[PDB]
Amino acid sequence: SMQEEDTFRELRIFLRNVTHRLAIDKRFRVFTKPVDPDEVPDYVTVIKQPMDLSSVISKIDLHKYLTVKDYLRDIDLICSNALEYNPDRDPGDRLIRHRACALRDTAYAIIKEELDEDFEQLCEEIQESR
Ligand SMILES: CC(=O)c1nc(NC(=O)[C@@H]2CNCCN2)sc1-c1cncc(N)c1
């Protein structure tokens, strides 16, 4: 229905705004673009489902997120990929792990503070009806 399409449009506007706020944060620049196979050749040895904030923006605009849970699954994938590719005590690893956890925590905190729980519940019930 028209009311349901309005609901998903509001979700997309909200998700673009959150994603922009993550992408301009200096701490998260490592997560703003895909990893380059020439710059990093061993990345695909470890990571089978790459994700980054530019890909998240593309998916919003392709209407791939119908709930905030769908969106947070990809935020969590950015974080879990970073943790798996950076598991060692090396300071470079540890810095990326710290930023990855901060990205996830920041996204969850924005949503907890700013997304109405009844709005998210409506998104879920529309999705469940399709
Ligand atoms: C600082 C750091 O590198 C770090 N590493 C983590 N490692 C891990 O989560 C995993 C889990 N079991 C240990 C090895 N593998 S959590 C974490 C972290 C700590 N406090 C604040 C923030 N933002 C991040």
Ligand SMILES: CC(=O)c1nc(NC(=O)[C@H]2CNCCN2)sc1-c1cncc(N)c1
């Ligand atoms: C996305 C990610 O997780 C990532 N991790 C890295 N880790 C390291 O370089 C660790 C690996 N262990 C040895 C010490 N260096 S570089 C990197 C990255 C690569 N190309 C483009 C972007 N934007 C980020």
